[PDB]
Every structure is written in C-alpha cells, then in structure tokens.
Amino acid sequence: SVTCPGGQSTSNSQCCVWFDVLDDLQTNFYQGSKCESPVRKILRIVFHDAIGFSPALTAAGQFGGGGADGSIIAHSNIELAFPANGGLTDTIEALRAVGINHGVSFGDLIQFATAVGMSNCPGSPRLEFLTGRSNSSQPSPPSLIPGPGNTVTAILDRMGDAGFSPDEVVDLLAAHSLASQEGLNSAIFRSPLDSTPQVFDTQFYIETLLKGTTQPGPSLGFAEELSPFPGEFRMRSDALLARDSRTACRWQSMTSSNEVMGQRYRAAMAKMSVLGFDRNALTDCSDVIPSAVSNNAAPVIPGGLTVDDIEVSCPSEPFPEIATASGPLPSLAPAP
Numbered sequence: 001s002v003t004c005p006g007g008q009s010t011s012n013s014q015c016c017v018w019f020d021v022l023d024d025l026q027t028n029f030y031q032g033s034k035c036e037s038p039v040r041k042i043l044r045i046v047f048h049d050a051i052g053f054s055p056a057l058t059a060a061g062q063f064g065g066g067g068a069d070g071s072i073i074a075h076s077n078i079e080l081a082f083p084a085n086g087g088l089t090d091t092i093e094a095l096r097a098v099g100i101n102h103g104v105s106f107g108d109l110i111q112f113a114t115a116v117g118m119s120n121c122p123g124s125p126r127l128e129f130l131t132g133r134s135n136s137s138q139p140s141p142p143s144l145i146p147g148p149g150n151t152v153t154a155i156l157d158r159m160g161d162a163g164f165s166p167d168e169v170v171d172l173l174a175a176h177s178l179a180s181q182e183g184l185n186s187a188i189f190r191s192p193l194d195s196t197p198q199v200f201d202t203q204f205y206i207e208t209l210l211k212g213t214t215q216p217g218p219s220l221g222f223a224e225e226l227s228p229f230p231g232e233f234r235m236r237s238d239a240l241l242a243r244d245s246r247t248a249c250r251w252q253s254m255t256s257s258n259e260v261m262g263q264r265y266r267a268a269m270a271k272m273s274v275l276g277f278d279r280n281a282l283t284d285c286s287d288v289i290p291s292a293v294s295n296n297a298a299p300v301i302p303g304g305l306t307v308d309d310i311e312v313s314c315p316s317e318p319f320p321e322i323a324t325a326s327g328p329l330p331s332l333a334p335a336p
C-alpha cells in the first residue's frame, strides 16, 4: 500500500513529499517544533494570502484575486507594500526558500506550514491539509485585508464578500488566542492579545470581554484600546466585535469550551484554505499532520476579576459559569 520512502503510511503518493517538508519546517523554521513567533507570523500570512479574494471585484469585471494561491510570496514585491502586511518579510523569505527547495507550490506550502505550526501549540485541533493548488498566481488586488481601525460593518462586508458569515468571522478569530502585536505599539513589542499566547484556548474571548482598565504602554498605538491588565494589548476591532450585537452572542459562546472553539475554528480554516479553488480537485494529505499536545487547563477569568468585570453583550444568553482565580492582577510577559 502507499508506504512513503521513510516508511510512513499515507493515503496517496502525492503526500510523500510533505513528510520531507515537515522535517525541514520543524527543525528549521520552527526551531525544534516550538510554538513561538514563526507560528504567529504564519497565521497572519495564511489569512492575508487567502483573503485576497473578491467575488464583487470579479462581478464588476476586475481581477478579484486568486485566494489561497501563495501570491503573497510569489508577488511579495507588490503585496508586502500593503498596510496590513508589515513585519512579514523575514518569514516570507524563509518560506520561499523551503518551497523552492522542496518543489511544492507556494499556496500549498502556506496551508501546510499553518497546520504544522499549530500542531506545536498545546490545545490545537488537527487542521485539514489538501495539496494540489497551482503554483501560478497574479498579485492580490489592494484593500482586501480587514484592518484594526475598520468598523464592524466594514469587516463583516469584506469577510462576507470573501464568503464568511458573521459567525465564521468570530470563529476565525480564535487564532488571536496565539497572538501578539509588534507594529501597532512598538514600545510594547510582542505584547500578547491574551494571557496564554502559546496555548490555543478560549482565553482570548474571555479577556477581550473584560472591562478595559489599563494602558499597557507609555502611549496608545494605532487602533489600541485600554486592556484588562498590564502587558496585554487590546485592538479596537477585537473589542468592537466582542461587543457588537451582530457578533456578540457567538463571541460569548466561544468562552467556555475549548472543544467547541477548536471544532468551529477547524471548519472555518478548511473553508478559508480553498478560497479560489475547488476542493474536489485537491488531494487530501491530512494524515501527514501530527497531533498537538492536549491542553488540560480549564477556562478562567484571571487575576481575581469576576463575572461583574465582563461587559456582557449578548442580550439573550446568560454568561456561562467560568472559574475565577484567587490572585493579584497578572502582568504579561512579551509573547516568545
């Protein structure tokens, strides 16, 4: 049966090359299978590559973007000049070299490096991995990536055009559970967006709902809001989507179960991975993706804050009963 050169069993012979790029990425790109900045930069890249897809531009007779086509690498010279693509150059060049060296398409490589990077982070689901996306791409049109200063209406229209419902936009944002910022407020470089930047969990949904109390840095950066405790950064779009009536009930439902969040995120990522492609024309190589270590911690409201400190915004559903922690308010270290 298809046994690959290294002796692993896979579904199709097209999956065998991916065991070599697995080894390369884990040893080199990810510095020994770690869940640090390279994983977080690849999650920004997979989103920025895939979202350059617009049915509305196509309808108006313009090129609407090829979706998850690897154009952010093949055409980095034009796409990294876009406002939302700062701080990605070094990661793009590292991925370029792996793609050229292994002979795999850039669009497939980005989806693969996302599933492999997430497997290094405790609590992650096993993402689907399909191979076969053409290596040819045209540059993404500008203005298709949502920005942190955009209103909720602007973000939902952009994401809706690409094909996501308001619920799926909230589901996709679970990736901010493994996040920090570097370019919005450089004075507090790598300030985390939740208290566990290395654990794929529910904390990001809980903590964005908390009352904004603290200014973490010397001044406020672009699209920065007050956060709940020292060291945590809060961006305006996340604060607004947590409280807006169109997204608030889904945001609240994401707070108490890591299992539900992981399933919803996996489904939304599988949809995003094939924007611009027919998934029935691709080959499934999901069995090449390893399991992540399980997260055994329960959701908690950190540092002595209680349910009275969260700004409940879903008028129909009572806030879930989440555990509290007896403690002084945390001060977060920079994400690694």
Ligand code: HEM
Pocket (backbone or CB within 6 Å): 037, 039, 040, 041, 043, 044, 047, 087, 146, 147, 148, 155, 172, 173, 175, 176, 178, 179, 180, 181, 182, 183, 184, 235, 237, 335
């Ligand atoms: C509603 C749209 C979203 C907006 C407006 C948004 C905006 C941003 C911004 C401004 C940053 C900080 C980047 C920096 O200064 O270094 C950030 C970080 C991040 N975002 Fe998003 N994001 C959104 C959705 C997503 C999605 C859907 C994903 C991917 C599945 C994603 C993954 C990440 C990750 C992992 C980071 C952390 C990067 C790092 O630590 O270096 N974001 N996002």
Ligand SMILES: *[C@@H]1O[C@H](CO)[C@@H](O[C@@H]2O[C@H](CO)[C@@H](O)[C@H](O)[C@H]2NC(C)=O)[C@H](O)[C@H]1NC(C)=O
Pocket (backbone or CB within 6 Å): 073, 074, 075, 096, 099, 100, 103, 104, 105, 106, 135, 136
């Ligand atoms: C995918 O297409 C890109 C071109 O867009 C190819 O990238 C070039 O590859 C050659 C050698 O193979 C390098 O010297 C160039 O510097 C690369 N250019 C860019 C923009 O990266 C790539 O080889 C193609 N990959 C496959 C498997 O066909």
Ligand SMILES: [C-]#N
Pocket (backbone or CB within 6 Å): 044, 047
């Ligand atoms: C996130 N961009």
Ligand SMILES: [Ca+2]
Pocket (backbone or CB within 6 Å): 048, 049, 050, 051, 052, 066, 067, 068, 069, 070, 071, 072, 140
């Ligand atoms: Ca693209």
Ligand SMILES: [Ca+2]
Pocket (backbone or CB within 6 Å): 176, 177, 178, 194, 195, 196, 197, 198, 199, 200, 201, 202, 203, 204
């Ligand atoms: Ca987290």
